[PDB]
Subunit: 388 residues, 4 copies
Amino acid sequence: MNYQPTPEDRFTFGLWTVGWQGRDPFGDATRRALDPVESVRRLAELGAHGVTFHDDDLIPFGSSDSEREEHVKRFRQALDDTGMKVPMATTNLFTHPVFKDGGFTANDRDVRRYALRKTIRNIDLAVELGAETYVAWGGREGAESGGAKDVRDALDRMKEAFDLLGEYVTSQGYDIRFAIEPKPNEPRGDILLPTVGHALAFIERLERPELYGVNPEVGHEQMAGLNFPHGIAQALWAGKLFHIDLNGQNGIKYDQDLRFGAGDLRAAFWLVDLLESAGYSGPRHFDFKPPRTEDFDGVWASAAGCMRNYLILKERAAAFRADPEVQEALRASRLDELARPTAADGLQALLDDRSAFEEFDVDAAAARGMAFERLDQLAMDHLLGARG
Amino acid sequence: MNYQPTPEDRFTFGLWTVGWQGRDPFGDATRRALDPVESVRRLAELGAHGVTFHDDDLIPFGSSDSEREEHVKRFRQALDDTGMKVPMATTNLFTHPVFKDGGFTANDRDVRRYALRKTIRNIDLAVELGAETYVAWGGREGAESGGAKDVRDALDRMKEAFDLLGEYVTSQGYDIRFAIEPKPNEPRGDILLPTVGHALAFIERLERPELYGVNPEVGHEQMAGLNFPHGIAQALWAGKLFHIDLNGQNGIKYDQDLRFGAGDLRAAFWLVDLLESAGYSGPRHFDFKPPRTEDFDGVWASAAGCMRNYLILKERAAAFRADPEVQEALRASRLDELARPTAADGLQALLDDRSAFEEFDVDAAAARGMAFERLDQLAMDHLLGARG
Amino acid sequence: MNYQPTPEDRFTFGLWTVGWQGRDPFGDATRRALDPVESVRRLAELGAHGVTFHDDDLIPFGSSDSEREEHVKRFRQALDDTGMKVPMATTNLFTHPVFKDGGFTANDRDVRRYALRKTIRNIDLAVELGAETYVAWGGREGAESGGAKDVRDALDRMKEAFDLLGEYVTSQGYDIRFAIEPKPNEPRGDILLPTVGHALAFIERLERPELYGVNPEVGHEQMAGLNFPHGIAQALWAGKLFHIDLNGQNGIKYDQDLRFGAGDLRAAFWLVDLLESAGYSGPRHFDFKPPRTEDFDGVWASAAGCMRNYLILKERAAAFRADPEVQEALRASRLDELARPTAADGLQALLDDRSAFEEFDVDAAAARGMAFERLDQLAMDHLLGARG
Amino acid sequence: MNYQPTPEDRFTFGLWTVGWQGRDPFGDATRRALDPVESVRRLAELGAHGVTFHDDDLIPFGSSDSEREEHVKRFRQALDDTGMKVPMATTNLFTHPVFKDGGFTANDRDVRRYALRKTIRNIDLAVELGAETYVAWGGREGAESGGAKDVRDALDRMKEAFDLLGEYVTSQGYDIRFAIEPKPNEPRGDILLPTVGHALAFIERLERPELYGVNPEVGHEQMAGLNFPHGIAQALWAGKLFHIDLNGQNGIKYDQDLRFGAGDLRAAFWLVDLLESAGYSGPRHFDFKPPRTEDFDGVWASAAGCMRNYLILKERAAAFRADPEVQEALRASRLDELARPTAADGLQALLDDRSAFEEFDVDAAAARGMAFERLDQLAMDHLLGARG
Ligand code: NI
Ligand code: NI
Ligand code: NI
Ligand code: NI
């Protein structure tokens, strides 16, 4: 009755997560840098399936074409030695001062062209390493003040950028899809496409919408006070959940990036329930930061904790849905009726159906209790392993 | 140099706004009810263009077909006497206990059919009164707990509802469009389609998307900590801003519905700037509540205040955009460059353009300051009428 | 290994909690009213220790002196029949329209005098029924706008009110203490004494500070995004935690009043840990609302759930502190060193101690990891009953 | 009719504000470092009264006693050359990795002793430079997880630290007072003494309370969604506002530190109104950050903007309080009655006064409107300079 991860569980980590040195807006690094090769090795030992990277995590900004080759070759050798995969890659368009007003929607046109070239270069690298998903997080696309950015022009520029990227992968014959990662704020005062919904809407305006989906992050939707499982359900409904980032957040404040399971524990339970129920089959990626209070031992403890907490929640959610008492409570709360069409009989039969209105007993309907609290206490008992 | 509204300004109010009696979750009504006919009269005297209604604001729930006719005829006479119009109408699907688990996405199928019949009935009434926009606010669509609602099934049901409504207006030959009004929470723990972005995305999945747009509300996006002007810009970009609701909100807390201009005053300034600049031509609707501390004199003072504050902001934003010093600062901050295509030369020329990457001087670009703070202080001076 | 409450567990409920009819700002009551006598009976059957009341919960506003006697006598008989106690009482100074601008700090002086008389009358009643704690929640003390309330004058008035109440109980020889209940907002735009800290500070300015403490509520501090267990620790440190209100809240939004255990589950765990560890011996009072989706069966299910979730958390926290692996991790994280004085040797020895500064090896100290993540994963394993 | 600051206006800035290089959690510095001597010079040219510093802003961490002397002597010469004063100083106990778990409440006892020695050393320096106020911001005192910190022990340690500091300044005969600066979160998950109220309460438990007050910051109380002017009024009421930090914040999110006037503009108006009305006579200190989008020209523009926006608000608030129409509206809203004692006649006369209860006409009182909306629209007109 234990919780050891296997590469079959598809757990992945970014190089930048366990390799975060602990620098925050008020303080210096508390840990030395990690060689990517060591991270790949340590993570493989913990049971992880693969790793992800920003271009600049793997190849130091300003590297010569040959230094580049050397960096990649060592990385590739660590992957061969461990069996680790690289399912996703992304571009760093936020750290260098040149991106201080954004990458794809910077006001300066020459910066936007440069942002696209830096991206295209890394897409080729990611296809070579086998990635299937290319993520875009526009961390610097946004503003601190109202006049600094015309948002209709900036969306035109954002669409222009993504359309060109889609032209490029289709012309090269690459099999890779894009995933946009929303965040409402930080480091910009307000960021463009702030939530899963804004990114889903945007995508429908691209030339080839089928090439793009979303990469939602637990803590990001919670920084807007939103229900993350609800957001994920809408993305699944639209057919657009191409990737997901897992972590923990305690409410509306700075982006904490705690390990998965920390923060809002019940939201984590309902998220795992939904992913496993909908048969989500992509990576379970952790975008998190071991607190700067920790040494390297606490770093690996924190990474193990991410995977452990997913597997415990997976087991409690599976026990909840398999419990006959729970299946009866779902029927008592009429979840089965929610799944049936309101009016498969069609508009005309509905208009002619007097039991839908003229003779509907509104008082008897209103008196029916929904029985949601007992259902929710059953879900609580199961999460806490208190089923008696 | 004053600020009197005229019916040309297209200011509208819901019957439920100035007619709110002051009941809140912790206290009794502090004001008597208003006859709709008196509200129409008082508002006409204040300079308003028109009024809006929920079915149940105008016709008491449970009214006989003849009481109904009487209520409508008196209303129509007040409109004829004053020249007031009715540009928008909506359905009350949230007050009656029968809607306690929602209208279109209630778990009980018979409640969902009833919700659609109650709606269709009011669409006919709204077309008779001349409305051009039919608003839907699903205030009860949502949940307090994770197991109570499968969100993929509920979105199926929501889409089913809106598709049927669109079939009905097209079969009747009615010229009316729908506008969905998002809200993140309250009165449900979490509400479905919580933000402008989620509603825009949803619409793209309907059978006839062209029939539907959004009706965003200032306070609702701010209850999620989001930038309302940014949200409106995205709706304008998508061609979907069919209506708008104006009011004030002080941050993330219960829905305050203060008069427009109250709450976040700078957001109000940038919103007015954007609406007038984009040539938004629909109603300027106020969805607000005079505080329950007030008597009827304070009610009409609060309603006048809404319109006054819009006209003052309109004048300050127009002065800001006409100021030659501001047009020069916009150029200094490269807003003009934001509006130009990144790569009208096409993908291949970009890939071959060495100044976009191989020979891009990243250090010189990064050193360019954006000059946003002086621009923002110019916007502040103009808002405060302190231009010297 | 089960979780049945007994009157020894000191669980109490307000009449207004299970008796809430479901009216919210957007909808009608969904449940009939409960007779106080039935609530006392049902709660006794569930294992509760006692009940609490507002004056107006027990005696309808505007009751004649004799109707009053009748209401009290029936109540007293239900208490005798069940063994239930009344440890706390409070005043309703927020529902009647007369309190729309507050009770003790209303701008109208005659309303403030009336507020004090209504209070004094109920203190006598509470002493007769045996209450030991008199709670004050100034739900209407505050403002929607900046000019409406001078806050220094209002604090003068608040202090005046509480000093007079203390003069009265000391002159009558009553053994009862007062507890102030903070809330940051709702129903007023901002409420005075918004958090536990503001109320603790205020008390130190009263004539007889020893007579007053706080009654913090889980959801209220969380509506300000604060850490409720931290807040409770500060109140315990000051010797001022005279009572506590338990419930659940999902983040910063309207006051949800969910059952205890719902909302932020980890905060609930750390709260129970602290109360049991500090030996808090007052009532465990639930101030919560069964969702309006529920019928009376769901009401009693929700109330049982409050007590069940406390007892489960109590058992997991006790298991955590008794676990030898956890006691070793606490030592590894230096919690033992936190409890020792920094400088019991005194100022002069510290100034003369060169190992505190001149010869302190700052680099070796900084490299020590705090081991907090493993400790926190041990706390998680224990909460989820996953200890292996 | 313009807005030029003079040293009489008592405007001050921290060295760390205009000298912030632009490093944030996601990106590199965008500006070179500033020599303290140049900042003192540039600020003097802008009209500032003085500067403040952390020990480590002025003397690089790890400096020899002689390098120290050199740094101080150049600084002192810049002060002599410009006439600038140093009214406040503070300690950096948050940047160095040694303070990763706090300074005064770190779990490691040797770190806490070192924190006190680093502090005492800087108090002597501050007294030499003439400061009157010594500020303490415990940015690292707090936790990311529940078990990492026992908050009652940590408050014991915090009190121990401040008592020793007070023993030291009294034994040295120094005339300097302490001011504690609260913040609810960031960089720790939750920080101890999170709001003005918590710090006021804490102080009352110190050995010599009269030596300590608060230094509230606009953005910090707003990160908890609180009303900053209300908070300042409570501090003034307690006699404890020894210093204040001014800046701008857009709601509940990461600490933005925008220039004063940005963020919530109406809160800024009511704050200035209160400070000038209560005769606050300390420094008007700006703790803010010029956005990293800016070059040095935008840095000085942003600093000028702080002072300009204070002087504009000062003029609008003074015009509001001097307006006879406003004085009449204050009387109409009964602000004059708020300032009168509720019961100067005493408890016994109140108990015997039948007009306070037996014969109080509650219905007539309730019908009185408070007239707050017209008052608030007068305040808006004055702020926008739209008085007609
Ligand atoms: Ni994040
Ligand atoms: Ni609203
Ligand atoms: Ni509450
Ligand atoms: Ni700050």
